[PDB]
Each structure stands twice: as structure tokens, then as C-alpha cells.
């Protein structure tokens, strides 16, 4: 029975009255990681091109209700890692039983934003069979004498306060009349007029001009007024329903309306079968012509729901997003499932120095700091997911496999494992990231790893204007709790820009190699953050609990909360916000004294002195 703060969900009547200041959970649901602009694209796949976009409609949380605001002590959680092939994320949620207006949770907003992916909340008018009520639709479409739409106003207020990038509007309730159809168009137009620049409103191909639910599976005369009405912009995009074999007609109508065909996202329903979903790909990506429209994936979270282990889940996501060759540079156009990498370049937000990754997948079986366990408990906190490799996977040489590991970690719960056979004297390379990182005096490459058979691990970097990677030995070594950290100063390359990062190794007499790679960074020396200014506050809904609230600090990636025990300290929470809820400490403080230590970790993972807090 969890009594901590939960991610929000509303019915219209609740939303109408919503105010951040009177919702004790609202501060916990705000994302503090802004949408990263300026992603850069790769070019490894000769079939992929730059016209079409990709939206994912993903149940990043399996349920709408009961989602803790900032993570939970559960390893098996949906730690989606293919942000690099998405242009837009729709948070899939909403139900007649729980609530029909659902913002994305803060943890997944942060992950999406770290990767430069805009993420939308959901407005779901359900089919009558699943409890849908026309009443809810009519409520949302109420218009003042203004004639503003107060519920639209609230949608914009929610997006602004929580920090996400718009809304996906899905009208599946039957019985709507033409008046209701017109009111919906007005509501959408009002959003266009009032929303901030950059905000995206996506409409589902369902309710037509008459109000009837009649999915078109294309942009047609019956639904085009929900996208563009003459000179009036109605929506930023349309998600097309699944029953199509060709999208040429949508492309043509889009052009006729003066809209990009790539604002239409042709739906594919992958929920049940994932990569075994039959799709007539040529109807979307014609031979020798531009893609007809963009692509919309409905429920690629199939990889998570149809699996029971983190390993099987990650393997399925690779099969889905990269395809059965397991190499995004080399895809099979004859396959029933060529993979998303066959059509879409991978994008990267490794475009600012310092670029830092610890290959944190956003959950773990245990939590480590500097290679030592600080919590034995399962955890997920997708605000801690790092920017993960652009390429899953590209190697040259040797007989090695690359996978994430949840058995070895330097910071967090995971590392990159690179392992298999490597003959004496042979070399192997693994290319991981597309980047755009300017090198200055004082910039260095650092990387931290374990090597079970004793092979050193060299770093690779590619420079703008060169096609080949430069593989180079580490210069300055430090051993940290069994891990080796190399530093390679890059001053000789000042004025240059790194466009790729990689690793390389040479085989030794054992003929085997087994690396765990726990950290990689391009960046300079930076001061420790100040100890956070922390206050203990009540969390009204739970007398037995507390919240810690600190002042915002610049350049702090996240906060760690440690508790003193007889056993030594224990990590009891992480936060990438301005606070964290902690259960049980009120109770515990009656039996014994509770001392907490809160650290701020900088963007280069330099910890502050801890703030020590007493609870008596």
C-alpha cells in the first residue's frame, strides 16, 4: 500500500478545477529536464532517409493510475531505449475507470527530453463499450462567451507546469452529432491559437465531419478539417488508423491542402505481435520515391508487455527497432520486418560538452556508486536513464557480443558488456555514438571499465572531416573499486569537433575478452556543486512520510539521499527534481534517530559535500 505522490490523471470536471498549489502531488510530477534541442542524425543506413518522421504511442507505464511520481523499487519497468529513432512520443494512457486526461509522468518526460524527443499527454474519449461517455466530450468542448475553451486552457496550463510538449487527442466515443464535430474543430483551432510555439497537438483519425466515428485510414475529405481548413491550421498532425495498404492518396491530399505529408502518421498496430505484425511497407515507403507519409507505431511497448525479464525485453526492442540483422547499418529490405533503422536515421543529443554517460538504462537490480553497491534493492528511475548508444550494434573484428549488463555497474544499475572471443593479436572495434562535440583546451576523454581477461580497453573518436575513427590508448590511469578509469587529454585537437565515439581492444593469449563499460565522457574539469539547501517538509496525504525540498542548483544532474544504518549508509532515494518523498521516516524516528545525507551530483558526476539532515 503505497502512500507517496502519484502521477496525475483527471476527468474533465476534475481538470476544470485543477490548480498546482492545491494538489500536494503536483510539485512531484514536474519535469525539470528541458527538451534538448538540436539532435544530430547518423548516416549509417543507405536505405534510410530524412523526409519521414516517426511517432510512438507507447504505454511507458502499464497503468494510468497508481504510478509513483519519480520512480519505484521495481527493476522490471518499461525503460524504453530507442528514443534515437523517434521524433515524437505519445504517452499512452487514459481509461473510463481512471481518468481520460493523462499527462506523462515526470520520469519519462525527463528521459524523452534528454534525448530531444517531444512527449505528449493523452486526452482519451473512450469507445462506449469501454465506458466512454459523451458527457466527457461535451464537458471538454464547453465554450465561454469569450469564446475561450476553459478546458483547453487547462490542458495548456498542465503542459506548461509539468513541462511537456503538447497533447494527443483521441475521440473514440460514438454518438457525437455534427454540432459536436464543429465544436471539436473549434477547440482544436483554439489550441493552435493559444499554445506556445513548439507545442504539438496530434489528432486521431476517428471522428469525421458528421460527428460519426468513421476511421478513414487515410487523410480524406471526411477528416481533413481536423488538420487544416483552408488557411486555418486545426492540428499539427494526424495519426491515421491502421486499415490501409497504400498512403499515396494521403500524400496527395496533404500537398493539395498545403500541408506536409509528413504531418500524417500512418498507423501500424504492433501491440499483439510486435515484429510479426504484417505491414505492407511499400504502401508507405514506395520503391524509388519519397516516403508517402510519416509512420505511427501503436504500442511498441509490446517488447515490455510480452516479456518477463529485462534481458528478453531489451532483446525484443533491438529486434523491433534495429531488425533481425542486429546491425542498423546493414538491414534486410526483403524481411517482413526490416526494422526501423531501415527507414529512419538514428538521432543523438550528444551535441554539447560535457557529454557524460554511465550506460544507465533507468532501472536496476541494485544501485552502485563508484563501483560499490550502495543499495541492494531493485529500483527504477527513468530520470536517471542516460543517453544510450546510437548504434545497437556496430562492430568490426573479433567474435564479441554487445549487450547491457545489470550485474555490473559503476554508477547506477547497469553497464555496457562487450564480450566473447578475440584471438591473440586480433583487433576489434565497437562504434557507439554519433556526436557533435567541440574540443577545446582542457577537454579530455575519460572512460571506466573492467576487463576480465586483462585486455586493455582503448577509446575511439571520429573527427569532423574524417571518415575513420582514431583509436588511442589511455594516458592517465586511476583504479576505483576494481574499475579502471583512463583519461586522455584532447588538447592537441582543440578547435576540432568529435563526431563519433567508439572503443577498441586487442586480443591476448587467453583468446577471450569480457569488458564491462561503466562510464564514458568528453569534457573538462568542473567544480563540485554546493551542498544542497534542504528542508524537511510535511507531505499532507501521508503523515507517516516526509518530503525533502531543496533549492534549484545549476549544473546538477541528480540528487542522492543516504540514510545512516548500523550497517553503514544506505541509498534510500534519487531525484532529478527539487524534492523527494520518503516513506516511514516519521515512524522510524520514534524508535531511533534518523540521519540523512543528501548529495548533489554534477553533470560530470562530481558529488557535492553531503547536506546532513536530522529527524528526531
Give residue limits of the domains in the chain. Answer: 1-348, 349-525, 526-616
Beta strands in 314-407 (DSSP E): 347-348, 355-357, 363-364, 367-369, 372-375, 379-380, 394-396, 399-405
CA atoms within 13 A on the CB side of 26: 15
- The answer on whether 407 is annotated among ligand-binding residues is no
Cα-based distances in Å from 515 to 70, 420, 479, 504: 32, 9, 15, 11
- The answer on whether 157 is annotated among ligand-binding residues is no
- Report DSSP state, residue 226: G
- The answer on whether 431 is annotated among ligand-binding residues is no
Domain 349-525 maps to which CATH number in 2.60.120.260, 3.40.50.1820, 3.40.50.300, 3.40.50.1100? 2.60.120.260
Task: Tell me the backbone φ, ψ of residue 382, rounded to 5 degrees.
Answer: -70, -5
Which pairing describes strands 200-204 and 237-240: parallel, antiparallel, or unpaired?
Answer: parallel
Length of the chain equals 616
- Report DSSP state, residue 610: P
Cα–Cα distance for residue pair 316/328, rounded to 1 Å: 15
Cell 525533502 belongs to which residue? 548
Fold (topology level) of 1-348:
TIM Barrel (3.20.20)
Resolution in A for the shown PDB structure?
A: 1.8
Closest CA to 583 of 542, 536, 611, 535: 542
Let me know: does 105 contact 383? Beta carbons within 8 Å: no
Report helix, strand and coil shares of the chain as percent, to nearest 5: 20, 30, 50
Beta strands in 33-172 (DSSP E): 40-41, 54-58, 88-91, 101-102, 119-125, 166-171
Cα–Cα distance for residue pair 97/81, rounded to 1 Å: 30
- The cell numbers describing 105, all together, are 509522468
β-bridge mates for residue 139, sequence order = none
Q: Taking the mean position of all CA atoms in its chain, how far away is CA 129?
A: 32
Let me know: does 304 contact 313? Beta carbons within 8 Å: yes
- The cell numbers describing 323, all together, are 531488425
- Coil, helix or strand for 337? coil
The structure's method of determination equals: X-ray
Q: Please state whether the peptide bond connecting residue 237 to the residue before it is cis, i.e. omega within 30 degrees of 0.
A: no
- Report DSSP state, residue 103: P
Let me know: does 404 contact 418? Beta carbons within 8 Å: no
Closest CA to 136 of 193, 95, 189: 95
Closest CA to 527 of 579, 602, 440, 453: 602
- Report DSSP state, residue 139: H
Alpha carbon distance, N-terminus to C-terminus of the chain: 25
Let me know: does 218 contact 251? Beta carbons within 8 Å: no
Closest CA to 152 of 201, 205, 209, 212: 201
Task: Tell me the backbone φ, ψ of residue 157, rounded to 5 degrees.
Answer: -60, -40
Let me know: does 345 contact 48? Beta carbons within 8 Å: yes
CA Rg value for the chain? 25
Which positions ≥6 away from 163 have C-beta within 8 Å? 30, 31, 32, 34, 109, 113
Q: Under CATH, which architecture does the 526-616 domain have?
A: Sandwich (2.60)
Angle, nearest 10°, between helix axes 150-162 and 178-194?
40
Q: What string of DSSP letters covers 408-450?
A: --SSBS-EEEEEEE--TT-EEEEEEEEEEEE--TT-EEEEEEE
Amino acid at each position: 500500500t503505497y502512500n507517496g505522490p502519484l502521477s496525475s490523471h483527471w476527468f474533465p470536471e476534475e481538470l476544470a478545477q485543477w490548480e498546482p498549489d492545491s494538489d500536494p502531488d503536483a510539485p512531484f510530477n514536474r519535469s525539470h529536464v528541458p527538451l534538448e534541442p538540436g539532435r544530430v542524425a547518423d548516416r549509417v543506413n543507405a536505405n534510410a532517409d530524412t523526409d519521414a518522421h516517426l511517432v510512438s504511442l507507447s504505454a511507458l507505464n502499464r497503468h494510468t493510475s497508481g504510478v509513483p511520481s519519480q520512480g519505484a523499487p521495481v527493476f522490471y519497468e518499461n525503460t524504453f531505449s530507442y528514443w534515437h529513432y523517434t521524433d515524437l512520443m505519445v504517452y499512452w494512457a487514459g481509461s473510463a475507470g481512471e481518468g481520460i486526461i493523462v499527462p506523462p509522468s515526470a520520469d519519462v518526460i525527463d528521459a524523452s527530453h534528454r534525448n530531444g524527443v517531444p512527449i505528449l499527454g493523452n486526452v482519451f474519449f473512450p469507445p462506449t463499450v469501454y465506458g466512454g461517455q459523451l458527457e466527457w466530450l461535451e464537458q471538454m468542448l464547453e465554450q465561454e462567451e469569450d469564446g475561450s475553451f476553459p478546458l483547453a486552457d487547462k490542458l495548456l496550463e498542465v503542459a506548461d507546469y509539468y513541462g511537456f510538449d503538447g497533447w494527443f487527442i483521441n475521440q473514440q466515443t460514438e454518438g457525437a452529432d455534427e454540432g459536436t464535430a464543429e465544436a471539436m474543430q473549434a477547440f482544436l483551432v483554439y489550441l493552435q491559437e493559444q499554445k506556445p510555439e513548439g507545442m504539438h497537438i496530434m489528432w486521431y483519425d476517428s471522428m469525421i465531419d458528421t460527428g460519426a466515428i468513421a476511421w478513414q485510414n487515410h487523410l480524406t475529405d471526411r477528416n481533413k478539417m481536423y488538420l487544416q481548413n483552408g488557411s486555418t491550421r486545426v492540428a499539427d498532425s494526424m495519426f491515421l488508423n491502421f486499415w490501409w495498404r497504400d498512403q499515396r492518396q494521403s500524400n496527395e491530399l496533404a500537398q493539395a491542402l498545403g500541408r506536409s505529408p509528413y504531418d500524417l502518421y500512418a498507423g501500424v498496430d504492433v501491440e499483439a505481435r510486435g515484429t510479426s505484425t504484417p505491414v505492407q511497407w511499400e504502401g508507405l515507403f514506395p520503391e524509388g520515391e519519397k516516403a508517402h507519409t510519416s509512420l505511427g507505431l501503436y504500442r511498441p511497448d509490446w517488447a515490455f508487455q510480452s516479456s518477463e525479464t529485462m534481458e528478453a525485453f531489451y532483446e525484443k526492442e533491438l529486434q523491433f527497432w534495429v531488425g533481425s540483422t542486429g546491425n542498423p547499418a546493414e538491414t534486410d529490405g526483403q524481411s517482413n520486418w526490416p526494422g526501423m533503422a531501415h527507414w529512419f536515421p538514428a538521432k543523438s543529443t550528444a551535441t554539447s560538452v560535457p557529454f557524460v554517460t554511465h550506460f544507465n538504462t533507468g532501472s536496476g537490480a541494485q544501485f552502485s556508486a563508484e563501483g560499490k553497491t550502495v543499495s541492494e534493492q531493485e529500483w527504477n528511475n527513468r530520470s536517471l536513464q542516460d543517453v544510450l548508444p546510437t548504434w545497437r550494434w556496430i562492430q568490426h573484428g573479433g567474435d564479441l557480443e554487445a549487450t547491457f549488463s545489470w550485474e555490473e555497474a559503476f554508477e547506477g544499475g547497469s553497464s555496457l558488456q562487450w564480450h566473447g572471443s578475440l584471438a591473440e593479436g586480433e583487433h576489434a572495434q565497437i562504434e557507439l555514438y554519433q556526436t557533435e562535440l567541440p574540443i577545446s583546451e582542457g577537454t579530455s576523454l575519460t572512460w571506466t571499465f573492467k576487463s576480465e581477461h586483462g585486455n586493455d580497453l582503448n577509446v575511439g573518436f571520429r573527427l569532423d572531416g574524417e571518415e575513420d575513427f582514431r583509436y588511442v590508448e589511455g594516458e592517465q590511469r586511476e583504479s576505483i573499486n576494481g574499475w579502471t578509469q583512463w583519461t586522455l587529454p584532447l588538447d592537441a585537437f582543440a578547435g576540432q569537433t568529435i563526431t563519433g565515439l567508439a572503443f577498441a581492444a586487442e586480443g591476448n593469449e587467453t583468446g577471450l575478452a569480457e569488458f564491462y563499460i561503466g562510464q564514458l565522457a568528453v569534457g573538462a574539469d568542473s567544480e563540485k556543486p554546493a551542498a544542497p539547501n534542504v528542508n524537511v517538509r510535511q507531505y499532507d496525504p501521508d503523515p507517516s512520510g516526509i518530503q525533502l525540498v531543496w533549492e534549484k542548483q545549476s549544473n546538477v544532474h541528480h540528487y542522492r539521499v543516504y540514510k545512516e544504518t548500523k550497517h553503514g549508509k544506505e541509498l534510500i532515494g534519487t531525484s532529478a527534481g527539487d524534492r523527494i518523498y520518503l516513506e516511514g521516516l516519521v515512524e522510524e524516528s520514534k524508535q531511533n534517530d534518523v540521519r540523512l545525507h543528501i548529495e548533489a551530483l554534477s553533470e560530470t558526476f562530481v558529488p557535492s559535500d553531503a547536506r546532513m539532515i536530522d529527524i528526531k
